[PDB]
């Protein structure tokens, strides 16, 4: 619809990738330039989705990329950012390291700055556009309270941190909001064969990532029967406007969270074409950048 397409590759087809390649192709200013893999993952049958679609080991295969959607473990991400933007590519992630975004953001802001480049990081459900929604709030009552209440929902940072453990042949992790920003962790562990269940949660429950906070653990006879990637975010603060007391503000969203979090990666990679070079975070970008459409037309339907 637009003159020259955004080509746009996915790195990495685990779960935002798969959703990722139907945000694109609903995206009316992109076209899929193709999705690279590692070779380990070359070598498994071809997905069904994926026919008529270039599969290859590295960018370089695809032709012109404009953008780069990183749909990459988290600790695995910064690195493979730093290399794409070297090659003037735009990144767009979802990295979700809050303490670490400012050092990683300062890191890509050098790299997309010595090539030509625009890196936006953290650019995903929480942090992403709840950060926005965070931030605006802020400052429509700069006293006071926020609470981010991330509904029951899938950690798979922490499903896998349960998986290493001795003696869980499977496991799933969920994060679970018991009020005012605290939360309450549950496993649901399938054991190895064999292995008693009273010590595997003697295991967990002494593990650095659930010591000081209250977790719960069941053992289940197949955790991929509980599995399900919804989501719920609910934010609330009460604060002052100016000096008037008890402002209130509650924001919700139930979604299914890689949709979600790919569309917002598709939607940062449109505002990324539109950045002088440099990383940013999502609160540092006009929000109109990340809409498609004629700038007056956007601003009467939504002003
Ligand atoms: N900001 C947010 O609100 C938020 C929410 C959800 C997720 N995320 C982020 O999104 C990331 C991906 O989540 P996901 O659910 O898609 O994970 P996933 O299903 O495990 O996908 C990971 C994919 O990355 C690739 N990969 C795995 N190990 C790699 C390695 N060592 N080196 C290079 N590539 C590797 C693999 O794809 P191939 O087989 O094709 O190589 C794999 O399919 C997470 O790390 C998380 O940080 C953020």
Known sequence: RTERPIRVAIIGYGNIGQYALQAVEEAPDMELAGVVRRQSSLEKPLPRELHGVSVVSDVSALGQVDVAVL????????????????????????????????????????????????AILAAGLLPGTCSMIRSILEFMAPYGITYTNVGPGMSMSASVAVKAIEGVKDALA?????????????????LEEGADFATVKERI???????????????????????????????????????????????????????????????????????????????????????????????????
């Open 71 to 118: 749909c990459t473990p988290t600790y695995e991400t910064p690195a493979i950012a730093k290399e794409l933007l070297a090659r003037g590519i735009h990144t767009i992630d979802s990295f979700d390291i809050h303490q670490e975004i400012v050092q990683v953001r300062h890191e890509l802001d050098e790299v997309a700055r010595a090539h030509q480049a625009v």
């Open 205 to 303: 429950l002494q593990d650095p990532l659930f010591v000081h906070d209250e977790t719960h653990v069941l053992q289940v006879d197949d955790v991929k029967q509980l599995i399900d990637r919804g989501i719920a975010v609910r934010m609330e603060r009460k604060g002052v406007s100016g000096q008037t007391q008890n402002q209130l503000f509650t924001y919700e969203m139930r979604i299914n969270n890689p949709a979600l979090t790919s569309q917002v990666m598709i939607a940062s990679a449109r505002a990324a074409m539109r950045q002088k070079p440099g990383a940013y975070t999502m609160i540092e970008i006009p929000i109109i950048d990340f809409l498609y459409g004629d700038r007056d037309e956007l601003i009467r339907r939504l002003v």
């Open 174 to 190: 969920l994060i679970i909001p018991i009020g005012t920003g605290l939360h309450r962790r549950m496993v649901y562990v399938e």
